[PDB]
């Protein structure tokens, strides 16, 4: 059974940060913080075939929200609490992944240390929204968001015109993987690097992952920011 969510609004910044990530994702991204919480959020468009290779977070917890479904996510049952141990053939070993064919407005919650990724397997561009919440061990980044917006900003070209995207380069793709550990991500550079099997039978243990409480709080922050409330910041 799926977990759903009705609305995750976007912080409306004066000059929107639009980034074409080296995973082939069109991001409208921002960071927000409040006294109690810090996070990055992106409303994204995923072209056919787009999406990041399997990766693991150490500084954030992630939410995926798929307003139109279509997106296929991949998720482990196994957790990788040690950033020093890559799940690779020569070391800690590659992991098993389970796929999720997302449904309209499905909300998927993925705590730090789980391996995940996703792809647009369809022939049309699909929307997706991410929230990356700063966890309790994350270092303080300039935007106090746990590091994710700084990551994308550092590795992906900035977009001017959505109808004339930057050409992603080899260096950008390599940097997307190699710069990732400084932002608390172990990011694979090809699909099967960290991967042993992909299975379509979803374990209940993954399906049940949920953190609505933190998400509703961050929505409050976003909506307050959009109302002009000065006790929160988004930029």
Q: Which residues are annotated as a binding site for Cu(2+)?
A: 3, 55, 57, 62, 116
- Select from 2, 88, 159, 175 the one that contacts a copy of itself (CB under 8 A): 88
Q: Judged by CB under 5 A, does residue 105 bind Cu ion?
A: no
Report, in Å, the least distance between residue 231 CB and Cu ion: 29
Q: Judged by CB under 5 A, does residue 55 bind Cl ion?
A: no
CA 18 to chain centre: 15
Residues that constitute the known binding site for Zn(2+): 55, 57, 62, 116, 144
∠ CA(96), CA(127), CA(56), 5° rounding? 30
- Select from 154, 168, 175, 202 the one that contacts a copy of itself (CB under 8 A): 168
CB 148 within 8 A of CB 60: yes
Report, in Å, the least distance between residue 95 CB and Cl ion: 8
- Give CA separation, 174 vs 94, 118, 171, 189, 232, in Å: 21, 19, 5, 7, 35
3 binds, among Cl ion, a copy of itself, Cu ion, none (CB under 5 to 8 A by kind): Cu ion
Report, in Å, the least distance between residue 122 CB and a copy of itself: 6
Give the x-and-dash track for 43-72 against Cu ion (CB under 5 A). Answer: -------------------x----------
Structure-token match 């407005």, residue found? 105
200 binds, among a copy of itself, Cu ion, Cl ion, none (CB under 5 to 8 A by kind): a copy of itself
Q: Judged by CB under 8 A, does residue 228 bind a copy of itself?
A: no
| 3 Cβ contact partners less than 8 Å away, ≥ 6 residues apart | 106, 107, 108, 109, 207, 210
CB 16 within 8 A of CB 43: no
Q: Judged by CB under 8 A, does residue 92 bind a copy of itself?
A: no
3-state secondary structure of 142: coil
């Amino acid at each position: 059974e799926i977990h759903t969510f009705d609305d995750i609004p976007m912080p409306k910044l004066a000059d929107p940060l639009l980034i074409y990530t080296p995973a082939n994702e069109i991001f409208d991204i921002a960071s927000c913080s409040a006294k109690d919480i810090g996070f990055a959020i992106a409303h994204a468009q995923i072209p056919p075939g787009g999406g990041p290779m399997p990766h693991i977070h150490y500084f954030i917890n992630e939410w995926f929200w798929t307003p139109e479904g279509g997106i296929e996510l991949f998720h482990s049952t196994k957790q990788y609490p040690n950033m020093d141990e890559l799940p690779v053939v020569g070391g800690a070993g590659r992991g098993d992944l389970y796929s999720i064919q997302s449904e309209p407005k499905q909300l998927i919650y993925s705590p730090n240390h789980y391996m995940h990724g996703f792809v647009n397997p369809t022939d049309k561009t699909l929307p997706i929204v991410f929230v990356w919440m700063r966890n309790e061990v994350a270092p303080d980044f300039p935007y106090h968001d746990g590091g994710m917006r700084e990551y994308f900003q550092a590795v992906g070209p900035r977009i001017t015109d959505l109808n004339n995207l930057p050409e992603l380069t080899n260096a950008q793709r390599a940097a997307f993987a190699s710069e990732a550990p400084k932002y608390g991500i172990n990011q694979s550079s090809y699909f099967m690097e960290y991967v042993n099997t992909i299975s379509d039978k979803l374990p209940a243990q993954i399906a049940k992952l949920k953190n609505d409480k933190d998400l509703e709080r961050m929505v409050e922050v976003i909506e307050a920011f959009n109302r002009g409330d000065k006790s929160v910041t988004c930029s």
